[PDB]
Structure formats: C-alpha cells, structure tokens
Amino acid sequence: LDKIHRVLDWAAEGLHNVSISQVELRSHIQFDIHETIIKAAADLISRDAPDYQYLAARLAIFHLRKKAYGQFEPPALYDHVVKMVEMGKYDNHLLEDYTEEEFKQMDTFIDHDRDMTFSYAAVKQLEGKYLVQNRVTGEIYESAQFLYILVAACLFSNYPRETRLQYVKRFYDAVSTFKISLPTPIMSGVRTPTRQFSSCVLIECGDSLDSINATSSAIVKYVSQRAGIGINAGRIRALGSPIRGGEAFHTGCIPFYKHFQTAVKSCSQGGAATLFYPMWHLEVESLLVLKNNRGVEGNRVRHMDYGVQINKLMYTRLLKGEDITLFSPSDVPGLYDAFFADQEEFERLYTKYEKDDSIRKQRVKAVELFSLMMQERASTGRIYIQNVDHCNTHSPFDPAIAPVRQSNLCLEIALPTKPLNDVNDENGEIALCTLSAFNLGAINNLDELEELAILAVRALDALLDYQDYPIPAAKRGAMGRRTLGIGVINFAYYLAKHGKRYSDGSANNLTHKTFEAIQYYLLKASNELAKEQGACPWFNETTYAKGILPIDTYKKDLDTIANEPLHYDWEALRESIKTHGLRNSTLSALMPSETSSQISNATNGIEPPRGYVSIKASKDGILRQVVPDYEHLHDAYELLWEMPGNDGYLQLVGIMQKFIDQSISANTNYDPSRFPSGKVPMQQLLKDLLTAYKFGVKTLYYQNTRDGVDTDDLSNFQL
Amino acid sequence: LLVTKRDGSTERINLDKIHRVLDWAAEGLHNVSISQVELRSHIQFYDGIKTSDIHETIIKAAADLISRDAPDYQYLAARLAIFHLRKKAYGQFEPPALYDHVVKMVEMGKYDNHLLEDYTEEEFKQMDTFIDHDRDMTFSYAAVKQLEGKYLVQNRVTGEIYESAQFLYILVAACLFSNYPRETRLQYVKRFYDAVSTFKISLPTPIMSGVRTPTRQFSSCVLIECGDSLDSINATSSAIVKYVSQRAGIGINAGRIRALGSPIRGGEAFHTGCIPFYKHFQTAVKSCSQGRGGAATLFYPMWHLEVESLLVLKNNRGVEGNRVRHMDYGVQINKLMYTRLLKGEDITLFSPSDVPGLYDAFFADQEEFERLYTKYEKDDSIRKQRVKAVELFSLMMQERASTGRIYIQNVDHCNTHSPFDPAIAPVRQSNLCLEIALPTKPLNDVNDENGEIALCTLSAFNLGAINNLDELEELAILAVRALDALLDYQDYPIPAAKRGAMGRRTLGIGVINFAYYLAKHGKRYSDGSANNLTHKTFEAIQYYLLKASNELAKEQGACPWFNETTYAKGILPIDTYKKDLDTIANEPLHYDWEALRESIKTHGLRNSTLSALMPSETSSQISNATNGIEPPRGYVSIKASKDGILRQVVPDYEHLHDAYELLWEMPGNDGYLQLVGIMQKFIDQSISANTNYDPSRFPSGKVPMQQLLKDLLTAYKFGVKTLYYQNTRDGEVDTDDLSNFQL
Ligand SMILES: Nc1ncnc2c1ncn2[C@H]1C[C@H](O)[C@@H](COP(=O)(O)OP(=O)(O)OP(=O)(O)O)O1
Ligand SMILES: Nc1ncnc2c1ncn2[C@H]1C[C@H](O)[C@@H](COP(=O)(O)OP(=O)(O)OP(=O)(O)O)O1
Ligand SMILES: Nc1ncnc2c1ncn2[C@H]1C[C@H](O)[C@@H](COP(=O)(O)OP(=O)(O)OP(=O)(O)O)O1
Ligand SMILES: [Cl-]
Ligand SMILES: [Cl-]
Ligand SMILES: [Cl-]
Ligand SMILES: [Cl-]
Ligand SMILES: [Cl-]
Ligand SMILES: [Cl-]
Ligand SMILES: [Mg+2]
Ligand SMILES: [Mg+2]
Ligand SMILES: [Mg+2]
Ligand code: NA
C-alpha cells in the first residue's frame, strides 16, 4: 500500500494541480498492478491539469527501469553493453571500437535523471518502437539514456581519439535534452546489428520497359524496408504512342502505374508512394482522377498519391484564360528537360511545338485543367503540387547538370535523380536523404545553432558511411552528393513563446531571422566539415560551387512581406564555400514530424496544432498530448482552425523557403463552415495556389478539409 | 445505270459478270446454288455503285449460306474472298513473279532484307516454280478470314493487303531453311512449302504472321519459375513484362514463395503473404494491355499453407484484397495427396520454407517426399495446418467447376514419365495451356545468366490430311528441322531464356483434326473403339519425330544439354509409361524402338523434347481442321465476329455426319481420358486435356462432386499429366465409394 503511495509521491514531485488522491481513486487498485496506476494517471491528462503527462511518464519510466534492470538504478554502461551484445541486441562493433575505460567515461556523461523529463506520449513511443526489446514478449532491455549515449557512440565511433569522446558527450547532451530530434530509423536502429536506416527514396523512371522494370524492382526492395517512395513516371509516353515505328503502340501510363502500385504494396498485409508527372502530359486528365472514388477499376489507381508538376507558363495560361496544350513527352524533343531546367527554352519549344501541326497534341482550357486538378486535390487531399521552375531557379543544384525533377512521399525532398536500366545499373541515380530536426522550443537563442549544426551535420554525415545500400544507384547518390535534410519541430510553440502568430503576418520577420540562422550555421558546419574531411565528390554540380547562395536566388516577392535584414556574414561564407566546398550538397528540408517530435513533446514540424490536447490511439491505450507550456501560452497559441485562411501560413512557408535547400511539406487548410453554403469556391482554391507560387513555394502537400471561376479577378495577379 | 470499276471508270451494268465469277468460284463444289446466292444478295443497284462493294455483298451472301446441308458454301465464299484479295494486293487476279514481289516488299520495308542476301534472283525464279497459286482455292471461308485478319502482311491503318497465301508459305519455307547448303536447300524449301500449303503441317500464328518480315519475335510460350526471395520475385516480374510485351503466354511457378506470417531472417520481419506478390505478377501480365490481353497460369502445390486462400482467387465473391481474378491457376498434386483422399484422411498444409527438402522432393523423388512429409507431419515444432482431404479436394474442384480455369498438374507423372532426369532437370510447372512440361530455374536478376526460362516452339501434324502414318516420316523431318532452325533464327530478350532454348532445343509438335481422323476411320471417343488406333497413331508420331531429331543430331550435333535427358540414359517413353495403360489397349509396337534406342544413345537427339498436344484453336481454322484432339461442339461452329456471322463446318460432314461424335453426345469423360492416357504414353511433354460436363445429364441439373472426383482419379490412373479447361455446357462425397479406386 504505502509502497505504492511513495512512488506516487515521488512521481508527483514538482508538479502543479495534480492529485494523488485522484490517481488512486481512478485506478481502482483497492478493488500487474503498477500498469493500472500508470493508465489512471494518463487518463487524467487535460487542459486544466497538463502536468499529469509528466506524472504518468515518470510512473512509466519507473516501471520500465524495474522491467529492464530489476531495480530503478541502471547498471554500469559497460556491463549493460556487454550483456546486450551477448544477447545479440547491440552491435558487437561497440566492444571493438571502444574500450572498457571509455565506456566508463561515457557512463560519466550519462544523466539517467533526464528520463524524468519525458512526457507520457514520449515514453509510450520509446517503449513502443525505439527502446531495444524482446521481439515477442515485449520485454524491454534498455532505458532512454542508454539509447541516446550509444547512438552518439556509434555515429562518432570512427573519430580520432583526440576528439571522439568530446563529440560523443556533445551529441548525447544535444539529443537527451531535446535540442536535436532524430528520426525513427536512427532512434530504433543505431547501436543494433541493423544497417537499414533509409526512410525516404526517390526513383526516376525512364521511358522504357527495362527502366519500368528496374523502377519496380527498386520500389519493392525499399518498401520492404518500409521506406516512403517518390516516383517520377512523367517520362512514360502517352497512350497510343508508336513503339519502334510504330511496330507496336503504347497501351498507356495507367497499366504501368498499376504495376508500380502493386510494387509499393507488395510487402503490405502499408507501403506509401507519391507519383509525379507534368501537367501538360497528354494523359493528364486521366491521371488526375486516378484516386477518384467513382469509376472503373481499369482507370483507377487509388492507393498512391500524386504530384502534379507545374511552371510559370502553365499559370500564365490560367491567368489569361487561354489554352494549355497537351503533349506526349516522346513527341516533343527537349521539352521535358527544359520544363525543369530552362524556362525560356521551355517557352520557346512549347510555343514552337504548339504551332507544329505534324505533332500529336490536344488542347484544353487552362481553367478547366486547373479546376479538375484542384477538384481532385480537394476531395482526396492527396493530389499534390510541385512548382518545378521554383525547384530549379532557387536550388543548391545546377539544373543543366543535376536538375530537380520530382520529390519524395511527403513533398519536402528535392534531389537529383537518374533512371535505371536495370536494378543494379551503376549509371542510375536514386536519391536518398538522411533526416533530423532542430527543436526550436528547446533552444535559448539562435546562436546556439552554431554548435548544434556542427553536431547534427557530422552525426548524419557519418551515418552515410555507416549505413548500407541495397541498390548501387542509391549508394552513388549518397556517396556522390552526401545530401542531408535537417528541418525543425516545435515551430508553433516557438511562435507562441515569442508572442507571434501564423495568420496575421506578425511572425514574418522572426521567421526570416530564424531560418537565416538555421541555414547559415548548417552551411558553415558543412563547410568546416569539408575543410577537415573533403567536400562531397560531386560538389562541382552544385550552385554553391559557383559561389551562388540561397540569398541570391530566392523569389523576390518575399521582399514585400518581410524587411528583416541578414544578420550573418554570408559573403565570408560565400568565399569559404567556393574555396573549401561543402561536405554535403544539401543541408535543409522541412519534413513533417508527427512521430519523432512526440519524444520532445513538440508541436509537429511547422504546423499549427489542431487543438491544445491531441488524442491518439495506441497499442495498449489512448495517448493524450498537451501542447508545450499550455498553462502559460494557451492564449498565445493559434490553433489550425482559428486561422482565417492560408495566406499568413503560406507567406511564412515562402519566407522559410528563401533559405531551405530542398523543400517544405506545406499544407493547405479549409473550413467549409467559413464559407457561404458550406462550400469552398474554386476561386479561393486557385487564389491560394497562385499565392503560394507568388512567394516561391516549391511544393504543396496535404490539403486538409475540416470535417465539422472569374479569370479576370486573377488577371491583375503578379506571378 | 452504271457501276464504278476498281480503277474508277464507269461501265454499264452487266449481271453476267456477276454470274461468271460465281460460276468460277463454284467449280467442283456440291449442293451450291448460284441462283440462291444471287437471290440472297438483293443487290441495290444505284448509279455509281462500286464493283468492290458489289463483290463484298456477294461474298457475304455466299458466307451466309454456309450450313451442314450445304457445307461447300464455305469454299464458294472463300474463293470469292481470295479473288477480292488478289485484286487488293496486285490489281489483278494473277500474282506477280516471286522475285519482283520480294524486291517490292523489301523496298517497302515489309519483308526482311536478308531474303535478297540469302537467295539470288535465279533461286527465286526456281522457288516461283514450286509455288501453286491455285492452292489458295483450297481454303475455307473461316481460313481466309484468319489469313486476312492476322497472317497476310498488310498495313492495317490503311487496311490494304500486300501478299497472298502462297507467298506467305514459300517465304516462311525460304527463311527457315536459308542457312542450309545449296546441295539440299531448295529441295527442303519445296518440300516444306508443299507440306504447309497442302495443310500437312500446321504452323503457329507467330510464325505464320512473322517469318519473312523484319521481326525476330516468335516466342509465344514462356515458363518462368520464381524463387522465394525479393530478388527473384523482381526478376520474375521483369521477365513477365518483357515477354507479355511480345504477347507471349506465361506460365508462372510461384509455389516456392513462403506463406503469410513466415519469419524472415529470424525473423527480423514477417511475411505479408503470397497474394500481394501474385497481384504484382498480375499487373506485370497486364502491363502491356489496354485497360483483353496478357495471359498467365500460375502454379502452386496443393499442400501450400495458403492453398485454401489461393484456390478462391478467381472467385467473384470476396473483397478485392483477397482476389487475383485475371490469371489462371494450376494446382500441383501427387500420389500421396490422392491417397489421403481415397482413405478419407487429412492433408497437412506446410509453408515450403518450414519443411526443408519437401518442395524439391515433391517433383523429383516421390519416396523422399513421402519420407519427409510424414516426418514433418509428426514434428510438432513445425508450423502446419491440417485439413480433410475431402474438403480440400472439393474446394478445388468447386472452383475449377465454377471458373473452368483452375487446372491440375500431376507432378509425379510429369517426372516419372519424362524425357528429363528429375535428379538433374526436374519439371516443376507447365505453361498457360497446360501442355508444356520443361525444366526451369529461378532467376536472381532479369539478366541472370544462371537462371533458366523455358521456351517451346510449336507446330502440329494434320491427321486429316495424311493418307497413311508412314507419311509422318518425311513430315517429321520437315517439321523438326524447320523449328530447330527457328531456334537459331529468333531473338531472345532474356539470357535465361536463350540458355534453355540453346541448351535443350525443346520442341512441341502436336496434332489437329483428331476428331475428323477418328470419324473417317469409323472410330469414336466414348466406347473404347479408338484405343488401339490412337496407340498406333501416336507411336508413329513419336517414333518418327525421334527418328528425325536423331538424324538431325548425327548431322548437326546433339543439343548441348542432352546428357540431362532420360534419352541419354538409353531410356524411352515406352519404358516409363503408366502401366495401367496395358489394360486399355493391346496394339503392338509397329516400329523398331530398340534400334532407335541404340541410335539415340550413340548420336543423341537434336531436341530434348519433340511432342506436346496443344489446343490450337486458331491454327486449325486455316486447314478447316477440328480443334486439336477435342471433339466438335456441333457440326457447325459459329463465330459472330467482325463482318458478321462466321460459320465453319466439320470436314466432310456430307459423308461422316453419323460417324462424328459431338462433345455433348458423350456419356462422360472416361473414353476421352483413356485416349489422352494412351497418347501420353508417347508424348514427350503433356496434353491440354479438357473435362466436360452437361448439367442436364444429371438429376436436379447439378454435376455431383463425386463425379468430378472420379474423373480426376481416372485421369491420374491412366498417367494423365495435366488437366486444362473444364467445360460446362450452357443449355456429398463418399470416400468409401472412392476406396475401390486403383491409382
Ligand atoms: N509491347 C508493348 N506494349 C505496350 N507498351 C509497350 C510495349 N513495349 C514497350 N512499351 C512501352 C514501354 C515504354 O514506355 C515504351 C517504350 O519501351 P521500350 O522498351 O523503350 O521500347 P523500344 O526501346 O524497343 O522502342 P522505342 O525506340 O520506341 O523506345 O513503350
Ligand atoms: N459491269 C458490271 N456490272 C455488274 N457487276 C459487275 C460489273 N463488273 C464487275 N462486276 C462485279 C463482278 C464481281 O462480282 C465484282 C468485282 O469484280 P471485279 O472484276 O474485281 O471488278 P472490276 O472489273 O472493277 O475489277 P478489275 O478491273 O480488276 O477487273 O463486281
Ligand atoms: N519486408 C518484407 N515484407 C514482406 N515480405 C517480405 C519482406 N522482405 C522479404 N519478403 C518476402 C519475399 C520472400 O518471399 C521472402 C524472403 O525474401 P528474401 O529476399 O529472400 O529475404 P532474405 O533472404 O533476406 O531472408 P531469408 O533468409 O529469410 O530468406 O520474404
Ligand atoms: Cl486501385
Ligand atoms: Cl524572382
Ligand atoms: Cl516523424
Ligand atoms: Cl483482380
Ligand atoms: Cl506405373
Ligand atoms: Cl492456335
Ligand atoms: Mg526505348
Ligand atoms: Mg473485272
Ligand atoms: Mg532469402
Ligand atoms: Na521488376
């Protein structure tokens, strides 16, 4: 009895508005036992008493210590590692790379009391998928600090003894205090005998059976490792196109899309993919309705998402109320390449081919085509936008040599690719990206990002050499460009604690300032890493190599929505990059973070919270999560459906994109009740779309619709 | 009034011109009425009416008069059509000289340019003298429609025809024998041309339509075995895509793929099931089809852990997640499975991954399979599921009945009676149509040089066109050599497929017009009256095929992988056949197999296999033959396609109507299955054997499961390797009753 009361007293230390009486009462313990107490505390998590999220977490942590060690106090780090290596749960390279004395020293870095800083949802995620445990019985073998210290130890294991343990302590401190947020594959895998860490894959399909086959094989290999897939299939020629003469005739893109879909789902009882194609593709009107609920199974491919690729010329046809001409890529020499790489050349070829009567083509009204796209985007939420000209005029890569011609599953990755002619084709290029994030809630000031960038960039860069590559074309891209994708979490909390909001423009200057610091320090870190270990082999293919920086090539319309000046010495950085190079071709990308950000109780990525308390279902109960410091900042927060429209948020995304190397998983959101007759007008959908383009937004991800066309009014619009 | 001639000029209407061409086409025909053809035409003579439209009206009228009482309208209409085609291609009835025709077509890019390299102008003059263009007048109307539809070189976006049938035949012959020495080349060309143009040898569609054109795509029959790995699954899928793009039929062995829930690497992961991979194979099959096209049969063992889920994949019920409806399936069975049924016992289902050695033994070693099977049944540590054999077999035959397209492969029969040593090159699957039986090996990559994809080149002897079995000696020589040359002639898009073809040089030569053949000999399917004749017939076929391939071996060398055959051991099909066949025939061997046995062991065979009995539903139409070994459905067959209603009458209905035995006049399947068993005694590969049932022959209009099972067991008893279609006419189980059965 009192043994339980003492643990409750212990877990409630330093908490406000929590009642041990209530936990006892709710648990019905008087009528294993500790698990019931944990759940009762978690069920008391609310707006009025958010601190229950820490009471329940600490009870849970206490329980896991006993479960793993038979006592609250963890064993010595060395004794733990030895035991786990023998059990085959840790990688045996740990005992070969580090001596017993070094494990003793690393143990002195460890602060096990930091386990008491997790929220309840954080502990459940750790227990659920991160902590090393028994496959079947679910018996946990470790605690959170052992995870953190060994992730740091593995990633910096090859560092010289002069600096190695110093880096290990730095990184361990950074992650265990939630300054740096690591993705799920790293949190679960690094320190274990696995080498599978790639979570997102970008594959470009060529217009041939061999490439379609290779692409399919590559998809299968990577979905079996539960990686998200980005597929460029826009090159595949249209239905009816001649083949060799034609000695045969093309039976269409859709049967090949269907084959890609069964590849994606081949290891699902699941697999997720986004497929990309140009808006002017001859089959586009058929491709746009592929997810539509009503139709024949023969002309539907519903279990993939799609990204429609658009440039300025397309939008211009819309604004002028003119036609868009559709072509098969096979019938228009140079057009596909120019679409991504050279806009004035695209316009030259496009108008030329439009006037050529010998070329198979179809004409549709731009209003009609755009409306069909946004109609399907609204009903599914899963028809995405890629502004391919923005992705190449404002890019780390020289589009003449390494154009960006697609994205990933979640539309934040922007990397070069090359089609494979065989699954083992050494001339192909499959884009991979290693991810992480800065927790904007946990940093005290922006200059703290200097060392954090050094730690984050070096840790991920070492992972590139550490991880394995199931496909040669994937290794080539990774070793060649060493592309990283570091983003942010807790942005909403960050804005709230600074008294700014999403929708009114109050955060425009702060956002400019914040993401200037992020990119500057990321670049500086990668530049210093290049001095020490050498620039990435294909650095010469970047705009950085030419002394071109993101501050040179951003969408100039940003100047009209923010006057925050640059605070860092970009001109000195410019010279140093041009001279010493970068270890990594890309550093930044703003991913969604709905899972990994739970560890630090962060708001998800750059998104506003839906509510003050989020309710999720889990393996063994319901998980409640309260936004950071609700107690003091509830009025400061701006919830998603409290925003009047998308303008404010889109302006912020544009401001971020000024500095981001890759792209951003930008959402659009609509509340039907905010409109007459409960219907979002097509005019509004198009306007926001145009707004996004105006401020340099590269991609549009989810369209969220809350569950509970005058072309003259767009004529004055300046793209 | 005026008609408009073909050259655009006008001319006064002259009905005598219509009468003349009808008179020409009716020459030698019986019971045809030119008056009736004229009356049936009701030609609406308006000013400017084209003679070409007049002629098409008259063709259709003649075609509409085709009936069992007046079958010769088949030929009246055909000759009128041939006439029409001569005009479209040549601007006159008489074809140009062969050399001038060939030069013109090569210039137009319609014929292969190698023709002009391999033969001089003089040699083309010589070949022209071989040609008899009047042989075009021997086609039936259905035949001409096939020629016009898919065989004659043409520009289909224009529609115009470029050649005639005898140019097709002569140049197929010229191309296939082009590499022969001048001492014998033109002699082979003439003999082969005569064989095909007089319908002695029937060639498959890829050859008829393609050989003489610039293409090298002729493979229409592909067998791919999938390994239990992502790499092989990917390779298999890629191989499927490549070959369906060439419109080949696919046989897929996916039986090795481990069951849903199976551990992987420990397991570090767990298997999500066969069905998602099957779905992937299906989209591969359909990848080059407008969303008809892309055809595959997928094979798996009866004892597979997921078999009950697999058997219902074509079922119209159920969610889309557990259905793969656009492929066919072949259930693999052996003696032990049937035995469990007879004794009313259980069958144990295993994932192939959980039973080391079982999968291989299933095909190659029945004794070892039985040892392993019972051992693993008694091992409680091995994941398994037990099901009543009655339940499992009933489910299978139920889905076979409802779809017609759940097939059976008796894998023990395929390996105990086989041209291949199962310890070296076992047969572990079949093809789309269940007559092919060849070795395979999984690929770990689409370009894997160590895998083996099975290919087969097909043809058939026309049993209705031969006058005695001894004619097969020369016909086998011609057929074997022509196909063997095609092996070196055609392309191979996948290395593993070239390996099998060059290594084994496997052929599949079958028959057409079997029903007509039985009728003219006064025999029938159902009463056993055809047993001895069938024995005599297929002994002659296999003997002469073997003799030809053996002589070809002496001349050009045995196939590289000949030592993997049972033939190389000195073993013949007459040594290994199902012994129960001794009870249903007493026809003695008429040919010297012992001398052949010695000759084969010394000089080998050019080809690892020679014979296989395919359906041949299209190629039979060319020679107006009854389809393969199947009995006719009726005296008159009808295809209501294209121009209108296309009718075809069985050969010589006039004299043999009472001699024919129609499919639905059969008391059952036993007579047919005995004949198949007798055929299989000599056939290298297998036979596309059909089962047939008329619900109205049974009480309450239901075909009893007891009967489905009895026929299944009867097939096995007489060594039948496979079962293809179950046909059900369109207009509960007692194991004690089955216990009597002797497998
Ligand atoms: N038989 C087919 N049926 C339907 N589509 C096909 C077929 N063959 C190829 N395709 C598709 C796949 C590709 O998208 C495209 C071209 O395929 P490919 O393998 O490159 O043919 P090819 O290279 O021999 O001819 P081409 O020079 O026209 O590309 O057409
Ligand atoms: N003057 C005519 N009056 C009525 N029918 C005719 C006449 N001339 C030809 N026909 C019929 C006979 C045939 O059934 C049909 C086509 O015969 P056909 O000889 O090919 O016509 P055609 O004379 O225009 O061709 P061609 O110039 O090659 O001789 O038209
Ligand atoms: N991630 C996955 N999800 C579902 N099925 C998978 C997955 N990976 C592989 N499979 C299937 C495909 C094969 O049928 C089978 C084994 O594939 P395979 O490529 O041979 O794995 P493996 O060789 O690394 O492990 P193992 O030694 O168990 O075969 O499991
Ligand atoms: Cl679908
Ligand atoms: Cl600009
Ligand atoms: Cl995440
Ligand atoms: Cl289906
Ligand atoms: Cl026997
Ligand atoms: Cl056929
Ligand atoms: Mg090509
Ligand atoms: Mg005439
Ligand atoms: Mg394996
Ligand atoms: Na593939």
Domain boundaries, chain A: 77-109+149-177, 430-659+683-691
Catalytic residue among A232, A392, A408, A439: A408
Considering only CA atoms, which residue is closest to atom 2 of ligand 1?
B245
Catalytic residue among A376, A412, A429, A541: A412
Which residues, at least 6 apart from B408, have a Cβ–Cβ distance to it below 8 Å? Answer: B330, B331, B333, B400, B712, B715, B722, B723
Other Cβ atoms less than 10 A from the Cβ of B674: the count is 26
Which residues, at least 6 apart from A573, have a Cβ–Cβ distance to it below 8 Å? Answer: A520, A523, A524, A527, A549
Nearest CA in chain A to B493: A210
Cα torsion for B297, B303, B304, B308, to the nearest 10°? 80
- Considering CB atoms only, which of B238, B268, B279 is closest to A217? B238
Residues of A whose CB is below 8 A from B273? 269
Residue A669 DSSP SS3: strand
Q: Is B499 annotated as a binding residue?
A: no
**Structure-block tokens of residue A217:** 């094989």
The CB-based long-range contact list for B336-342 (8 Å cut-off, 24+ gap) reads: B336/B366, B336/B369, B336/B370, B336/B373, B337/B302, B337/B303, B337/B389, B338/B713, B338/B716, B338/B743, B339/B743, B340/B389, B341/B389, B341/B390, B341/B393, B341/B709, B341/B735, B341/B738, B342/B713, B342/B735, B342/B738, B342/B739, B342/B741, B342/B743
The whole-angstrom distance between B290's CA and the closest CA on chain A is 5
Contact status, residue A418 vs residue A476, Cβ threshold 8 Å = no
**Alpha carbon distance A325, A345 (integer Å):** 16
| Residue B415 main-chain phi, psi, to 5 deg | -120, -20
Q: Is B691 annotated as a binding residue?
A: no
**Is any Cβ of chain A less than 8 angstroms from the Cβ of B217?**
no
**Is any Cβ of chain B less than 8 angstroms from the Cβ of A423?**
yes
b/e map of B257-283 (b: 16 or more CB within 10 Å)? bbbbebbbeeeeeebbbbbbbbbbbbb
Q: In which element (H, E) is residue B221 found? A: strand B221-225
Contact status, residue B352 vs residue B271, Cβ threshold 8 Å = no
**Alpha carbon distance A139, A130 (integer Å):** 13
**Alpha carbon distance A466, A502 (integer Å):** 40
Residue B323 DSSP SS3: coil
Among this protein's residues, is B456 annotated catalytic?
A: no
Note residues around ion ligand 12 (Cβ under 5 angstroms): B 229
**Alpha carbon distance A546, B269 (integer Å):** 46
**Alpha carbon distance A264, B334 (integer Å):** 36
- Which of B238, B274, B277 to probe the A interface (max A CBs under 10 A)? B238
- Ligand 4 geometric centre to CA of A412 (Å): 25
Among this protein's residues, is A412 annotated catalytic?
A: yes
The whole-angstrom distance between A295's CA and the closest CA on chain B is 13
The whole-angstrom distance between A255's CA and the closest CA on chain B is 5
- Which of B237, B245, B265, B324 to probe the A interface (max A CBs under 10 A)? B237
State which fold the A430-659+683-691 domain adopts: Anaerobic Ribonucleotide-triphosphate Reductase Large Chain (3.20.70)
DSSP H helical ranges for A12-136: 20-27, 34-42, 52-69, 77-86, 93-97, 100-109, 120-125
- Ligand 5 geometric centre to CA of A516 (Å): 18
C-alpha A683, offset from chain centre: 30
**Structure-block tokens of residue B734:** 């007692």
DSSP H helical ranges for B408-530: 413-416, 472-489, 495-504, 514-520
Helices (H) and strands (E) in chain B, counts: 30, 21
**Nearest ligand 3 atom to alpha carbon A226:** 1
**Alpha carbon distance B694, B662 (integer Å):** 13
**Sign, CA torsion B528/B532/B535/B536:** negative
Considering only CA atoms, which residue is closest to atom 18 of ligand 2?
B51
Strand partners of residue A363: A325
Q: In which element (H, E) is residue A457 found? A: helix A449-466
Q: How large is the greatest C-alpha to C-alpha distance in chain A, in angstroms?
A: 90
Provide the terminal-to-terminal Cα distance of chain A, rounded to the nearest Å. 70
**Is any Cβ of chain A less than 8 angstroms from the Cβ of B215?**
yes
Kind of pairing, strands A383-387 and A613-618?
unpaired
Look at chain A and count its residues. Answer: 719
Nearest in space to B385 (alpha carbons), one of B352, B413, B425, B348: B348
| DSSP state, residue A546 | G
Resolution of the structure, angstroms:
2.1
